[PDB]
Design a binder for this molecule. Structure first.
Ligand SMILES: COC(=O)Nc1ccc(Cc2ccncc2)cc1
Length: 119
């Protein structure tokens, strides 16, 4: 029932994502010089360094907020892909499955801890 445990659990999950070769296109903001029309399609850019920085700044209140930003990285990749068979999109699908598999217990434990706090 540790209400604060999610933060280090998220730091460790982010460390695992950074070690994954599938995260390489998503470690830094999309290069607008290489994809000049990117902001015509994508309203809110997001990447794993921004997520890590937001967490380290103490600007996430809950793992649900972190999860919303990580999910935005994947929906941006799906929205920008010209094909469902593109390399970067295919990497986002595997990385998304890995993320969802690992974030599930973080979300469950935090919500359980908060319910216990308000029992
Ligand atoms: C400096 O790193 C980048 O610019 N990385 C990157 C990440 C996503 C995209 C967008 C995309 C393209 C094709 N399929 C799916 C999504 C482009 C580039």
């Amino acid at each position: 029932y540790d209400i604060q445990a999610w933060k280090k659990q998220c730091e460790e999950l982010l460390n695992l994502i950074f070690q994954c070769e599938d995260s390489e296109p998503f470690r830094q903001p999309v290069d607008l010089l290489e994809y000049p029309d990117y902001r015509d399609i994508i309203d809110t850019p997001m990447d794993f360094a921004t997520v890590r920085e937001t967490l380290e700044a103490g600007n996430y209140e809950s793992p649900m907020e972190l999860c919303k930003d990580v999910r935005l990285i994947f929906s941006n990749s799906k929205a920008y892909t010209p094909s469902k068979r593109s390399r970067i999109y295919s990497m986002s699908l595997r990385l998304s499955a890995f993320f969802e598999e690992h974030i599930s217990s973080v979300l469950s434990d935090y919500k359980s801890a908060l319910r216990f706090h308000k029992r």
